[PDB]
Amino acid sequence: SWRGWNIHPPSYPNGKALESFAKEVAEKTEGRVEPKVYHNAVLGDQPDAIEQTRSGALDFANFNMGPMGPIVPAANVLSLPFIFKSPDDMYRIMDGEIGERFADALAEKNLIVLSWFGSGARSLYNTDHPVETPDDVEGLKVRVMNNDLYVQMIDEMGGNATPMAYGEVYQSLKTGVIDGAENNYPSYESSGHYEVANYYSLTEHLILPECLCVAKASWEELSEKDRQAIREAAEDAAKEQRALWEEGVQASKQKILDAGVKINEVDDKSAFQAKMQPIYDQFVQEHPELESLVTDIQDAQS
Ligand SMILES: O=C(O)[C@H]1O[C@@H](O)[C@H](O)[C@@H](O)[C@@H]1O
């Protein structure tokens, strides 16, 4: 018996892929390993679940790499704004040697990465006006996930930020406690945020991988043959997740458009990116040992 964690609903692309993984694992191990996925963060918010998985209280999970940054230093590289040019670049990079360096870093903190899920690009949405240039972010209080890099990101754009659990964002928008947040289409849609924050502006400022990972303790207990089988199941599940993801993005977009959401491309994404320089400079000064990881990712997209 394995318990697994997903923050999203069962029908979200990630949810479907995880159920496929769970089935394939049970089938390939002849019932020796029987994973059960707990969706909707039933077993805790993301930071607490990461903790429970490191200690082996939870057996597997789909984590966004953003919240992984405060736990695994190398993972913070993935939260540098605009580090990836597109999700396709991110997939190519994460499926190759650079992705292995991230897996190595997570393993040191007791998480065994089996495959990488996509989460598109995250963009700003708010209740007040289209964002066309960085100066339009002035005056907006924007929710971010709990990584200091995201507060720095919003601050450099011109606004102000506040870290908050995903589950709380909807009501916080409804009550006016925050003016906006940022995410991909499927989250913006499935969470209901689009019902309150009607302006979605395509900053596409973060392209965050997500892992499908196992507690090191749970991993080590297995036979060698079952590890090989579960690794295969995870790879198949990620392939499925990425296919479901593309469809899901288009379906979510059409739904929010039909609902009257105002979507705008920004004037010039490079103007937002240029403002991020101090973030990169400070990062590589703090972490000289991670500088070559930053430059290797940048260089791999020329
Ligand atoms: O903004 C957030 O908290 C959420 O964003 C979504 O894109 C991620 O898939 C989910 O893991 C995060 O919890």
Side-chain angles (χ1 to χ4, degrees):
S1 188
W2 269 12
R3 312 145 93 207
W5 183 93
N6 176 29
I7 191 160
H8 298 283
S11 68
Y12 196 79
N14 300 31
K16 295 175 172 168
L18 288 170
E19 290 291 357
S20 293
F21 169 73
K23 291 168 170 80
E24 191 172 331
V25 169
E27 296 157 359
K28 284 199 196 286
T29 65
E30 298 166 359
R32 287 186 290 279
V33 185
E34 306 182 10
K36 194 173 292 193
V37 185
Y38 288 79
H39 306 270
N40 296 128
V42 165
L43 300 177
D45 182 31
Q46 194 142 197
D48 297 321
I50 287 171
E51 183 168 30
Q52 291 179 68
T53 306
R54 293 178 63 206
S55 72
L58 295 172
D59 301 288
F60 70 105
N62 163 212
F63 295 131
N64 189 275
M65 292 297 269
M68 191 64 63
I71 298 152
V72 182
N76 276 307
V77 170
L78 300 173
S79 288
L80 291 165
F82 303 99
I83 195 165
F84 294 112
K85 291 184 180 180
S86 66
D88 280 331
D89 286 286
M90 175 277 299
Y91 289 140
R92 178 177 77 247
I93 287 164
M94 298 303 292
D95 288 338
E97 180 274 326
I98 289 173
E100 281 296 326
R101 288 184 229 178
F102 288 105
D104 285 349
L106 266 70
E108 144 171 290
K109 303 289 180 175
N110 279 353
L111 297 170
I112 308 304
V113 173
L114 302 188
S115 64
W116 303 107
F117 287 1
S119 73
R122 305 171 67 99
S123 293
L124 288 171
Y125 46 90
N126 78 102
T127 61
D128 190 88
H129 59 264
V131 168
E132 300 287 22
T133 64
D135 284 8
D136 295 324
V137 186
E138 292 166 5
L140 302 179
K141 183 159 184 279
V142 189
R143 177 267 180 178
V144 293
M145 293 188 292
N146 196 26
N147 186 323
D148 289 352
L149 282 174
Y150 307 147
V151 176
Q152 206 180 4
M153 175 185 80
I154 297 298
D155 287 6
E156 290 293 358
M157 290 181 180
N160 68 92
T162 182
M164 184 184 312
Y166 184 49
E168 291 174 15
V169 174
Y170 177 78
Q171 289 303 327
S172 190
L173 289 166
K174 209 167 137 76
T175 63
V177 171
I178 55 177
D179 307 314
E182 46 78 55
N183 225 311
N184 52 49
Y185 280 124
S187 285
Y188 175 57
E189 170 271 308
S190 64
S191 68
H193 298 173
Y194 76 99
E195 297 167 16
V196 175
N198 206 55
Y199 299 94
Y200 189 93
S201 300
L202 288 161
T203 49
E204 301 179 322
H205 51 251
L206 289 161
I207 289 163
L208 285 166
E210 312 205 341
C211 61
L212 170 48
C213 69
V214 174
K216 182 181 290 207
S218 298
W219 193 239
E220 291 185 333
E221 285 172 330
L222 301 171
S223 68
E224 189 273 322
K225 188 186 56 149
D226 282 354
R227 279 187 286 282
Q228 166 179 341
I230 294 172
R231 197 170 275 289
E232 186 180 2
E235 289 163 12
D236 298 342
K239 186 163 163 278
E240 178 186 5
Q241 188 270 344
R242 298 177 190 184
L244 292 175
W245 184 255
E246 295 304 311
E247 195 271 336
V249 167
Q250 285 314 293
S252 287
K253 185 174 172 186
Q254 196 50 56
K255 169 171 176 194
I256 65 172
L257 282 173
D258 289 348
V261 170
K262 301 170 183 165
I263 301 176
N264 70 288
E265 304 284 355
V266 299
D267 278 12
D268 176 14
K269 280 168 60 178
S270 85
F272 282 86
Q273 180 170 13
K275 285 189 145 62
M276 310 293 96
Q277 192 64 55
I279 300 180
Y280 280 74
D281 294 349
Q282 167 189 335
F283 186 83
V284 299
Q285 293 171 28
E286 285 160 0
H287 297 110
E289 77 290 354
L290 293 179
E291 181 160 14
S292 73
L293 184 51
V294 178
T295 62
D296 286 347
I297 289 164
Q298 297 173 318
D299 290 354
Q301 304 173 79
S302 293

